Ligand binder design. Structure first.
Ligand SMILES: Nc1nc2c(ncn2[C@@H]2O[C@H](COP(=O)(O)OP(=O)(O)NP(=O)(O)O)[C@@H](O)[C@H]2O)c(=O)[nH]1
Ligand SMILES: [Cl-]
Ligand SMILES: [Cl-]
Ligand SMILES: [Mg+2]
Ligand SMILES: [Zn+2]
Lengths: 205, 127, 13, 994
């Protein structure tokens, strides 16, 4: 019960960060450009059983483009990403959409405007209208603040499964087990942990 | 006329909003694991207390382990509202694994209260 | 959350 | 083993290729990842295209053939004109032949749409290179071949669709202006034949897949073709009737008719007006009979999400709004067209009920267009009276939380709708409120929504009507609060009551006794422990004050003193249970009121009384803190100090220039505190290392420093008496902050220092030239060394740094003139360094500083410094600007790059650079800078872009330099150049386009 999802958009828009957040829960501060594509299985628990997304996180930089539209073949859904702090990335949305629907003529697509956590927003809400005539679902999102970070997958799940009432549900929590010569090993690793400051100490949580 | 989650066997001792970190020693870096409600759950049969924490919206488990009496909460150098401690068996991602966790709270007050409840729970697992 | 003061001020016009 | 295909010395094993491809697409894990890197290396091979014929012939894997076409695509796009002429013909015939064969095989044509569509796109790339000048018979032969086979005909429609897209929709910034115009004219010249084919297919039927492909191509044509093809034929009849019946063609047809509504059409032809009415009438007819009636519940339909219903209803909304926004006037006069007009709008009402944010915004934009028109246009609103009445309910029931864009849009429409009929609006809202009381529509969300709606129309009714309305609403809400039980339910209602009153300041202003009771109640709520109430109380308090401040500062008839005095007397009691942030908002609100007192002696007295608590706490700290500097280690003392300063920031924010007396009260001791705190931070970093900066102890200390800087910045940015700023504030400030910043280690330096200095230079920079010099000396070099190793580290310092250089360059350029030559060199390096940032906060300032710098130098005239500047740095700026223009990694700054370059080039061609920019050795004596500039640039581009011909470079520069007075054209030429550097064999005559 798995679906191929292609994730496209300009370099630096936060595609890989967004996926990483969903995979591990981490927020990657550094920008390490994706080379070609990285495939990441991503499973969600729903009232209609588990749904698996094979996320093809593609490269946004042209010099690292790889197979480019070759990555889109037999994709069953997609996310187009841009950056609300960078107008040029929205200006290129029509280009990504073009290359996408030429290979995938009839698939559910979500348009995502990322980084709405940043104060000085450049791509204003009222000017974001490209999705209208193309029947794309649109969401403001932030991989950093997790604003609407689940909406794209929830909407895509509902379309692919064909149930508008599909909901994410709590996965079963098994009873954890109870618990040598490695009392020195953990004390070493723990000493380093205490003396390494937690990130973003100014955040609300 | 004829008409037309494996945790409901437990008791919620303590609940608090928190952000959980795991320490990646290879990179010497704290990585976020999840944000949401951190719960102390007491099994009504065994009376053993565990930590269960889920991510908001997705509700995916980001912490699941017994509050062992062997564990010790330490302060982090850069925070007055967090605790650091080693975990030897967490089954959030599946198979039992050991982690060095850090959990941060909304305030020093919630942090101190957490440690109070944490040690209370340890005494219960101590039987 | 009682607000008897509000009514009294409203009825005063 | 998979890496065998990467060996081109041996024959390519097609079987091995397909395995690598399958391992990538259908495989997983490490094998997939390894295959991925192998495939990329394969297609990236500049000789891979030669082995494309093999793959397309001998392969059985469609994905392998797809990748083969991608390799070809890359060749055609970039190196086509470099190939031998024989290879060009060979590739062409191979692609045509491949397409023909796939069309003749019904099995392949049916099961490999992807490979065919890719082959078609590849053909289109060839056409963009070869057609029509070297392929004049393409369209004739295309039309001919279409009559023989249905499959070929359908595929030709796909080719023509793709062709139209590449030429008209996506040609900008992908081909030169000359190339685009050439292809546009070519398609334009032969479209008569294409339309004939198109119309015949549509009229004669009958293959669904063929009709749809034809309509899909028609959608693209409508973007550019002249209106006559649509109105002087029967095609509107076919679209608006025949094709609206079948769901297969319905979707695409509706999109065509939407674009038809956007066609350029003469507004004087009465016959064309009837044709425009007619196809609308037909379309709405088919929808009512074949899809759903006007009474249908589209909300429910959309929710069920059966089939393509959601896309259809989206498209219907777009069609109705597009047509009606432009043509509804055509339906408003003729009485026989009234039913049509209102049915169309009734569909829009039903669409507006759908639960879908982005769809609602689409319809709401139309509703705004309508009610705005009814508000101004005579004799119109009576037509839409029943539509507007329904709309009022729809908008009220879907009102969103104000905090924002959607709310403001909803507010505007609802305000218009209230003007159009105040009576009906009031009735709906009261009725809605009654259903909150009887519990039939009671919920936390529903009462909040209604409250926001009721609050949004304030100031639209008459004052007397508003008064009657407000009173009725508050009474009803008051009674609703008593009705409920439990604090949770009571809290929601109580908050809404406070929200509404806060939205009707005109009412509060007219009734002091009530206003007083409101404020007094808010003060009571500031003690309420229930979550959210205290925040609500403070936010409402300051909100009311902002609008009614005058009624707090004057003596009311039934009062002994201005109410502001009463608030201050009990301020300790009132705010005792508030969090620090909430207290600061309270003080800020008091400052707003005090600022309205125009009697200076009274204002200062109120200010002193307001700041009584923080000043006493402050005085006690300064005594204890200096006597025992160890006190500052105490986190509690640090927190107290921070909150005192924050209170001063809060009041200063609302009082601005009036805050000066309070500033002077604390100023000298505050800067002494700044120094003492600075020492401790340094001492802590020395004893514990850099990690100390991460500790709560030091972060607490740095907060004090940051808040002090913020307070000074806040005042100076709003100061009216700049003489006092200069003669009292600046010197102690600089002595307190500059050396401390310079002599701290990088991780201990506060970026807020740079920000504060930016404001100082901004407001009084012209009056302290010695001061500005001192600022540069203390922060310039040491900050630059922090940020000039990479683009990531010290992001805040990075942004503030260039904001500071910018204002100094604007206000006190003399400071840079006083720099030693070595330091001025770093200044130039710093500016170019800013060009190369992707971070737009840095990039834009970098370019602006560069532009303003050139201008500053220019105003100096013919003097030694200006002359030495050009000799040293002119060609550095020209080349650095060119680099970011052409490296494809700074496209965000194109406009400002172009402007800077144009300014640089204009200096020479206006002879504003007196001295020669060259050595007497490299160029004969007497050569103008104009000629030397061309040589330098010609040589620079030749080495940077060796695949360009000398003719291209010469033509480009010839065009660029003579267009250096016209920015739009200049930019066009640059964009043409950016296209040509991406390929080989670009036409140099393209630069003669203007
Ligand atoms: N403030 C903020 N930063 C974000 C957000 N999402 C991503 N970033 C940051 O953007 C930068 C690039 O992230 P990245 O995931 O690599 O983008 P990308 O689209 O995958 N780049 P590429 O296409 O080249 O692989 C990172 O520094 C990341 O921290 C966000 O939501 N808010
Ligand atoms: Cl549309
Ligand atoms: Cl909605
Ligand atoms: Mg990436
Ligand atoms: Zn056509």
């Amino acid at each position: 019960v798995q679906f191929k999802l292609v994730l496209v958009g300009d370099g630096g828009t936060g595609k890989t960060t967004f996926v990483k957040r969903h995979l591990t829960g981490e927020f990657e501060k550094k920008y390490v450009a994706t080379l070609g594509v990285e495939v990441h299985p991503l499973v969600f628990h729903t009232n209609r059983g588990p749904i698996k997304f094979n996320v093809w996180d593609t490269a946004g930089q042209e010099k690292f483009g790889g197979l480019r539209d070759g990555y889109y073949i037999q994709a069953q859904c997609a996310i187009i990403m841009f950056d609300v702090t960078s107008r040029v990335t929205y200006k290129n949305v029509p280009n990504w959409h073009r290359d996408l629907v030429r290979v995938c003529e009839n698939i559910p697509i979500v348009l995502c405007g990322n980084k709405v956590d940043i104060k000085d927003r450049k791509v204003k809400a009222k000017s974001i209208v490209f999705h209208r005539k193309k029947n794309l679902q649109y969401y403001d999102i932030s991989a950093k603040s997790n604003y609407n970070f689940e909406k794209p997958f929830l909407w895509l799940a509902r379309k692919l499964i064909g149930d508008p009432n599909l909901e994410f549900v709590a996965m079963p929590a098994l009873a954890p087990p109870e618990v040598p010569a490695l009392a020195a090993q953990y004390e070493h690793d723990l000493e380093v942990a205490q003396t390494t400051a937690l990130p973003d100490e100014d955040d609300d949580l | 006329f004829e008409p037309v989650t494996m945790e409901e066997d437990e008791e919620v001792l303590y609940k608090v909003r928190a952000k959980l970190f795991r320490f990646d020693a290879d990179a010497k870096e704290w990585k976020e694991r999840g944000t949401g409600d951190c719960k102390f759950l007491k099994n009504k049969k065994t009376n053993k207390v565990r930590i269960l924490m889920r991510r908001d919206k997705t509700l995916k488990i980001c912490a699941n382990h017994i509050i062992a009496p062997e564990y010790t909460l330490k302060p982090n150098v850069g925070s007055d509202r967090s605790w650091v401690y080693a975990c030897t068996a967490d089954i959030a991602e599946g198979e039992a694994e050991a982690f060095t966790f850090a959990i941060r709270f909304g305030s020093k007050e919630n942090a101190d209260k957490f440690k109070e409840e944490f040690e209370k729970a340890q005494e219960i697992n101590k039987k | 959350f009682e607000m008897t003061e509000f009514n009294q001020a409203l009825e005063e016009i | 083993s998979m890496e065998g295909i990467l060996d081109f010395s041996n024959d390519l094993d097609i079987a091995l290729l397909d395995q690598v491809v399958s391992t990538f697409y259908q495989g997983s894990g490490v094998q997939q990842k390894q295959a991925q890197e192998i495939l990329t290396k394969f297609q990236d091979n500049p000789d891979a295209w030669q082995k494309a014929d093999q793959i397309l012939q001998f392969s059985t894997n469609p994905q392998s053939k797809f990748i083969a076409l991608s390799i070809l695509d890359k060749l055609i796009t970039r190196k086509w004109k470099l190939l031998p002429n024989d290879h060009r013909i060979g590739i062409r015939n191979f692609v045509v032949g491949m397409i023909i064969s796939m069309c003749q095989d019904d099995e392949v044509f049916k099961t490999q749409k992807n490979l065919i569509n890719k082959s078609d796109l590849t053909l289109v790339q060839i056409l963009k290179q070869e057609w029509p000048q070297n392929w004049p018979e393409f369209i004739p032969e295309l039309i001919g071949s279409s009559s023989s086979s249905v499959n070929v005909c359908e595929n030709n429609m796909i080719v023509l669709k793709l062709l139209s897209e590449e030429v008209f929709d996506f040609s900008a910034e992908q081909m030169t202006q000359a190339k685009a115009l050439h292809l546009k004219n070519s398609m334009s010249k032969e479209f008569e034949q294409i339309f004939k084919l198109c119309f015949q297919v549509l009229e004669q039927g009958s293959s669904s897949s063929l009709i749809v492909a034809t309509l899909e191509s028609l959608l693209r044509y409508l973007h550019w073709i002249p209106y006559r093809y649509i109105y002087e034929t029967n095609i509107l009849e076919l679209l608006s009737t025949k094709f609206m019946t079948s769901p297969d063609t319905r979707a695409i047809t509706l999109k065509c008719l939407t674009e038809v509504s956007n066609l350029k059409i003469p507004q004087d032809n009465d016959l064309i007006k009837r044709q425009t009415v007619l196809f609308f009438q037909n379309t709405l007819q088919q929808i009512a009979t074949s899809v759903m009636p006007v009474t249908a519940d589209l909300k429910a339909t959309y929710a069920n999400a059966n089939g393509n219903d959601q896309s259809f209803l989206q498209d219907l909304a777009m069609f109705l709004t597009t047509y009606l926004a432009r043509n509804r006037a055509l339906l408003e006069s003729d009485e026989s067209l009234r039913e049509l007009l209102l049915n169309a709008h009734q569909y829009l009402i039903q669409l507006s009920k759908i639960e879908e944010r982005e769809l609602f915004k689409t319809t709401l934009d139309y509703w705004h267009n309508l009610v705005a028109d009814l508000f101004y246009e005579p004799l119109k609103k009576h037509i839409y009276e029943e539509i507007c009445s329904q709309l009022r309910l729809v908008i009220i029931e879907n009102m969103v939380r104000p905090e924002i864009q959607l709310y403001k849009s909803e507010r505007e429409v609802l305000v218009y709708l209230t003007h159009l009929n105040v009576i009906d609006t009031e009735e709906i809202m009261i009725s809605k409120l009654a259903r909150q009381i009887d519990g039939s529509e009671w919920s936390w969300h529903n009462i909040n929504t209604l409250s926001w709606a009721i609050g949004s129309i304030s100031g639209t009714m008459s004052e007397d009507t508003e008064k009657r309305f407000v009173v009725t609403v508050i009474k009803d809400l008051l009674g609703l609060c008593e009705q409920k039980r439990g604090k949770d339910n009571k809290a929601v209602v109580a908050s809404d009551i406070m929200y509404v009153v806060g939205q009707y300041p005109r009412f509060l202003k007219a009734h002091w006794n009530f206003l007083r009771t409101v404020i007094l109640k808010l003060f009571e709520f500031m003690h309420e422990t229930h979550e959210g109430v205290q925040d609500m109380a403070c936010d409402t308090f300051i909100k009311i004050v902002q609008k009614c401040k005058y009624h707090f500062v004057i003596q009311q008839p039934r009062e002994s003193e201005p109410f502001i005095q009463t608030i201050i007397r009990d301020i300790q009691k009132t705010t005792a249970d508030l969090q620090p942030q909430q207290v600061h908002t309270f003080y800020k609100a008091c400052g707003i009121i005090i600022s309205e007192e125009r009697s200076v002696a009274e204002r200062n007295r109120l200010l002193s009384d307001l700041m009584q608590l923080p000043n006493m706490a402050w005085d006690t700290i300064v005594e204890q803190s200096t006597a025992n500097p160890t006190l500052l280690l105490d986190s509690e003392t640090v927190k107290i100090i921070a909150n005192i300063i924050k209170t001063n920031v809060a009041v200063c924010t609302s009082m601005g220039a009036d805050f000066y007396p309070q500033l002077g009260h604390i100023y000298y001791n505050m800067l002494q505190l700044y120094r003492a705190v600075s020492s401790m931070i340094s001492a802590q970093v020395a004893a514990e290392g850099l990690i100390a900066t991460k500790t709560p102890k030091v972060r607490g200390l740095r907060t004090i420093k940051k808040e002090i800087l913020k307070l000074v910045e806040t005042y100076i940015s709003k100061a009216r008496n700049l003489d006092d700023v200069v003669k009292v504030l600046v010197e102690p400030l600089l002595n307190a902050v500059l050396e401390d910043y310079m002599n701290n280690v990088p991780d201990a330096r506060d970026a807020e220092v740079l920000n504060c200095m930016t404001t100082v230079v901004e407001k009084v920079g012209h009056m302290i030239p010695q001061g500005v010099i001192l600022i540069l000396q203390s922060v310039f070099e040491c900050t630059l060394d922090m940020i000039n190793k990479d683009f990531t580290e010290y992001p805040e310092h990075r942004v503030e740094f260039y904001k500071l250089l910018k204002v100094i360059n604007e206000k006190s350029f003399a400071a840079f003139l006083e720099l030693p030559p070595a330091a001025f060199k770093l200044f130039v390096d710093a500016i170019c360094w800013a060009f190369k940032h992707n971070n737009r906060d840095v990039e834009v300032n970098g370019l602006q500083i560069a532009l303003d710098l050139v201008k500053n130098i220019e105003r100096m005239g013919n003097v030694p410094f200006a002359n030495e500047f050009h000799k040293n740095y002119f060609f550095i700026f020209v080349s650095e600007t060119f680099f970011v223009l052409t490296d494809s990694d700074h496209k965000s700054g194109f406009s400002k790059q172009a402007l800077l370059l144009m300014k640089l080039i204009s200096l020479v061609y206006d002879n504003k650079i007196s001295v020669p920019l060259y050595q007497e050795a490299e160029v004969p004596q007497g050569t103008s800078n104009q000629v030397y500039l061309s040589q330098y640039l010609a040589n620079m581009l030749s080495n940077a872009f060796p695949h360009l011909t000398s003719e291209q470079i010469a033509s480009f520069l010839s065009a660029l330099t003579k267009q250096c007075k016209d920015l739009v054209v200049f930019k066009g030429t640059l964009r043409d150049f950016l296209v040509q550097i991406k390929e080989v064999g670009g036409d140099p005559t393209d630069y003669l386009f203007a």
